[PDB]
């Protein structure tokens, strides 16, 4: 079974997920998945065609477990890992504002998403972070956006130039 919307990879993960019945185990597995399969810094592109779907299924399980394990206040103000969401948000915005450059800034923003994206951090704080972190990142990136030549920019990004035709 190799389908677009339904295949063995997706079925396999649905089973693995059904076996996550503890908040701590489930939350840890969601963060691990994000480090392993999301963003251009993912540890691997093996799940490129199904990771978006699988991740949503993992989030569902973490959300459900968190709502059953947490009291009302913690559900609104704590991360699935037991951290205070506001401290994390402020601590991360603090790091963002001290970012020396755009390369340090992208690492902070991208990492923040991989670690705290909603079922982990409450959305209210998370989108407040997106608002603040995204602002600084853009300000650093869009300054003199065209000054660096492509030859030099490819080096800074650190890609391996495979083929150039002109």
């Amino acid at each position: 079974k190799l389908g677009i919307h339904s295949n063995d990879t997706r079925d396999a993960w649905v089973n693995k997920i059904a076996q996550l019945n503890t908040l701590e185990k489930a939350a840890e597995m969601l963060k691990q998945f994000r480090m392993d399969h999301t963003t251009p810094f993912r540890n691997s592109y093996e799940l490129d065609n199904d990771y978006l779907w699988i991740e949503a299924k993992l989030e569902e399980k973490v959300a459900v477990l968190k709502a059953r394990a947490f009291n009302e206040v913690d559900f609104r103000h704590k991360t699935a890992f037991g951290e205070d969401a506001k401290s994390v948000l402020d601590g991360t915005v603090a790091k963002m504002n001290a970012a020396k450059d755009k390369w340090e800034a992208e690492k902070i923003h991208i990492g923040f998403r991989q670690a705290y994206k909603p079922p982990i951090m409450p959305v209210n704080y998370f989108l407040d972070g997106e608002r603040q972190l995204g602002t600084r990142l853009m300000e650093l990136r869009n300054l003199n956006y065209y000054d660096t030549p492509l030859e030099e920019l490819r080096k800074q990004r650190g890609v391996r130039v495979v083929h150039l035709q002109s």
Binding site: I4, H5, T38, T39, L52, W53, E55, A56, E59, E60, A63, V64, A67, R68, E72, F75, R76, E106, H109, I110, F112, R113, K117, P118, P122, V123, N124, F126, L127, D128, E130, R131, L133, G134, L137, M138, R141
Partner: protein, 388 residues
């Protein structure tokens, strides 16, 4: 000129014949129903559903989407155009919602247009009939101009609360409903100002400037907690469903219904004011229209979701508790307005019974739908403490 220069394929002999010649003997497929694949909520698919459902290009990783793959361009940082991360609520399909009034754009502006033109006719009849003569001067210059006027800012704020939702809603049907709930709120805010502007034309000395009502809202006591709540719902909530839910199934259902129906609609008549009730009739019609939608999305679709029912109810119960406190405070502060009325206008019993009507309707229409254990006498007693 006579026939014009442009030739049209439908009427130009030469072109039409070319077109007719290339046509097939019959349609290349007999399924002439756009949206045939959409699951009908009612007996047969409606025009409302066909023209709306699946308009939003979501991929399958967002519950209910028919597309596939990631978005083509995301925000700096990686945030997706639309994503599950913008709300705490989960569902098996974000496209299940249906506005029970089946409103797509045409039916929506048609009805509001009718209301607009009739409103215009009403005022011209009201002014020409000189009905303003029988309205109590104090009620007019003090309660309508200052207090009803200040309420426009409440509705304006609730309108603005919908801005993020218009951007983050996870489906076409929820986005259209949301957009219409918010648009009806800005409309009410403007009708409050319209009444003030009308009075300024038929009553010598009446100032239509918003300065007085705005000062009441921003610095007065009667609406202080109301304003604090509105400011929070609008700017401190980043979850589009928490916003729509808390606004319509908590704050506006208790505070809004009390102010509009149990205060102005109930007392204006006593002071010879048939003008304000005309506009409040629109506001209440709109409130009940929105309620149907709100109930279908949060209770029929999310609160009764086959897979996430328990979860969603726990979250909504949470949001209800979070927003019921500021709402109670808003009502409590507003109680201060009863002391301003001329003696004998109303008494503690009438005020109490009216509080109970609002609270009982709320428990029946919303609270009970998610098993929120509301104690009606406890809520009313907390509010009455504001009576001076």
């Amino acid at each position: 000129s006579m026939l014009g220069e442009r030739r049209r394929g439908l009427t130009d002999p030469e072109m039409a014949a070319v077109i007719l010649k290339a046509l097939p003997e019959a349609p290349l497929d007999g399924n002439n129903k756009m949206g045939y694949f959409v699951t009908p909520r009612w007996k047969r698919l409606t025009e409302y559903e066909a023209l709306t459902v699946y308009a939003q290009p979501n991929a399958d990783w967002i519950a209910g989407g028919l597309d596939w793959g990631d978005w083509t361009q995301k925000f700096h940082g990686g945030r997706p155009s639309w994503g599950n991360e913008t709300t705490e609520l989960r569902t098996v399909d974000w496209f299940k919602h249906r506005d029970p009034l089946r409103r797509w754009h045409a039916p929506y502006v048609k009805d509001k247009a009718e209301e607009w033109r009739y409103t215009d006719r009403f005022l011209q009849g009201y002014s020409a009939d000189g009905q303003i003569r029988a309205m109590n001067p104090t009620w007019r210059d003090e309660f309508i101009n200052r207090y009803w006027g200040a309420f426009l800012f409440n509705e304006y704020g609730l309108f603005n609360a919908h801005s993020q939702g218009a951007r983050e809603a996870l489906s076409d049907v929820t986005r259209v409903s949301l957009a219409f709930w918010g648009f009806d709120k800005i409309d009410i805010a403007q009708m409050i100002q319209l009444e003030r502007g009308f009075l300024a034309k038929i009553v010598p000395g009446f100032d239509e400037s918003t300065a007085v009502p705005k000062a009441e809202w921003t610095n007065g006591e009667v609406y202080k907690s109301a304003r604090l709540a509105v400011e929070g719902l609008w700017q401190e909530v980043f979850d589009w469903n928490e916003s729509a839910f808390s606004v319509h199934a908590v704050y506006d259902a208790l505070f809004g219904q009390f102010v509009r129906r149990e205060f102005f609609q109930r007392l204006a008549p006593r002071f010879g004011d048939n003008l304000t009730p005309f506009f409040i009739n629109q506001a209440q019609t709109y409130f009940q229209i929105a309620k149907q939608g709100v109930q279908d999305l949060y209770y029929n679709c999310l609160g009764d979701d086959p897979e996430f029912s328990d979860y969603n109810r726990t979250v909504m119960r949470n949001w209800t508790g979070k927003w019921l406190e500021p709402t109670i405070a808003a009502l409590r502060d507003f109680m201060g307005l009863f002391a301003k009325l001329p003696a004998g206008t109303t008494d503690k019993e009438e005020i109490t019974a009216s509080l109970y009507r609002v609270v009982d309707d709320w428990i029946e229409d919303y609270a009970s739908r998610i098993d929120f254990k509301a104690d009606r006498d406890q809520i009313v007693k907390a509010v009455l403490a504001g009576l001076k």
